[PDB]
Each structure stands twice: as structure tokens, then as C-alpha cells.
Design a protein around this ligand. Sequence first.
Ligand code: NKZ
Ligand code: CL
Ligand code: CL
Length: 333
Amino acid sequence: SGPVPSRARVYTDVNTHRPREYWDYESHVVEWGNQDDYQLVRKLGRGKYSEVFEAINITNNEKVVVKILKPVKKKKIKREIKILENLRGGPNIITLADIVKDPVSRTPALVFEHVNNTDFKQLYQTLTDYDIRFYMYEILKALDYCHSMGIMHRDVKPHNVMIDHEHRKLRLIDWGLAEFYHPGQEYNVRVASRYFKGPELLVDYQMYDYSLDMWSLGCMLASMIFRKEPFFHGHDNYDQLVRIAKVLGTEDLYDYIDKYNIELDPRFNDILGRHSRKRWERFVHSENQHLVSPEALDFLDKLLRYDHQSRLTAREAMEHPYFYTVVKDQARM
Ligand SMILES: Brc1cccc2nn[nH]c12
Ligand SMILES: [Cl-]
Ligand SMILES: [Cl-]
């Protein structure tokens, strides 16, 4: 018969208990402002597939970031707006300041609070042990918040984390793939960037939850403490699962597939083979050993599980011994 159903271990019913308007983004009515309140200063480098500008609010001479929404379903645009409005003011969440259309092209754009175009990817292979712990804890505050608000990010990766290293400030950005969690909803598995895709995405298990973000976070942590970018380096989406299976082992993979009665794409039958679960010590060498501790490996091991239900929640992660010194230093401000 079909795949075995799954529910989030935490924040399972939070959208059900909200008014319909909170999560029913298709029925959201946007008041569209005038892009002529803003003057674009310069294009920010965000890849071939993104149009983001530094701009000035000409009324108050404030710096902002403008994101021009490349043509895409109006439903996706409402979804990102409604999620950004719901999360506005949450810890380490980017602030949506305005929603505007070009008066001529009528192209929709999002206006955000200014952040420097310094993403985590530029910094996260040069950090101290303490700074990896510090910024991981700041990312967890954003994830525990959006999860508690019934939202999964689904595109957690270094490029989507903006850091002001001088002020030790972080923002989680690009909510364009984010969704509301509803118990029993089957989601699109064609989300996230290859190297950060959870096993649920790779084996086509659609009834996933907030725990997807916790896999992505584990991939980022592994890349940082082992200085191995990316940690799971697949040629394509099929090879991605093989790269995972060569570390996590095939026994736990086939147990996962059996537990949720997953129908494994036939292409997997040749390429997964048979692999032991590897000890993390295998990835430790003289140029990363200063970032690796028993605490870091214990924490990483609890994020990188095939079974999405087994992974730490954001709040459980924030309680791990890996963050004791960060928590203590925060309480003393
Ligand atoms: Br770049 C950038 C900056 C601020 C918010 C953003 N949301 N998506 N990309 C963003
Ligand atoms: Cl990235
Ligand atoms: Cl989607």
C-alpha cells in the first residue's frame, strides 16, 4: 500500500489553532506600494538566478534592500509575503519593510531592512570554534521561531544566512521556498539546493516537516567543523543519496525506507550498494581538528539522521552541551 503517514514531533497543530487568514495565503490581499519611493543604488551579487539591489528610501534617506520577484506564480509571491509578514520581528528573521510594484513594468518587489551583502558562505570556512557555536545558535533562534510560528524554511544553506561579523548579527533570508506546516499535507520534494537536500526529498517522501531544516543545518555544521564544502558532494540528486549512504551507512537507510514503507525509485537499486556507518573521526585532520570536539560530533550526529522524526528539534538542539558556553556568555550579556 502507500507510504506510512508522519507528523511533526513539535508545533504539530499550531496552524490549525490560528485563524484561517494566518496560513491561507491564497486569500491574502496585498496593498501594493509605489517602487518610486525607492531609488536603486547598485545590484548585489546573488547569482544568475536572483535580482537584489541596494536602494535608498528617498523619503527618509534610509538604506534598504529591494528584491525584484522574477516572474513566478502569483500564489508563490503571496506565500512569501504572508510568511514574511507573519515572521516580522522574530529573532534573526529579515524584516519586510514594504511591498511595491514598478509603476510601468508592474513587476512586484519586496523591500527589506538593509543588511550588508556578506553571506555566511564567505565567512563560514574561516571561523573559530566559538564563532561556529555562536552563529549556529543564532540560526537556531530563527528556526525555532519560524517552526513555532508553523513555518518551515526549506532552503537553509550558507548563501541564505546574512552575517554582519563586526556586530555579530545574523539574519535568515530568502523565504521564497518557505511553506506552512499542516499535519498530513504532502509537500513538493523539489525544494532546497542539492547539497542540503534531506533524505526525505531524495527518496520522494512528501509528508515532511520542520525537521527538513534540521538536516540542512547539520550539512552546514559538518561543512564548517570539517572544512569540507560541501560535506555531501553529489553529482546529481541520485548521487546525493549515495554520498549520504557512504557516511550514514545503508543499514539505517533501508530501515528508514522500511519504516515509512517508501517505494525507492528503481535507479537507486544499482548505485546505493552496501556501506558501514562511518565514525566522524574519519573526517578529522590537522587543518580542522581545532573545530572538532566530542560535543560538536555528538551534536552533528543527532542532526544527520535518515529518519526525520529522530532529528533534534531546533529547541532540543539549542539545549545541547555544544552551546553551554554560548548560553552562559549570553546570560552575562
Ligand atoms: Br539578498 C536578500 C536580502 C534581504 C532579504 C532577502 N530575501 N531574499 N533575498 C534577500
Ligand atoms: Cl550555499
Ligand atoms: Cl512548493
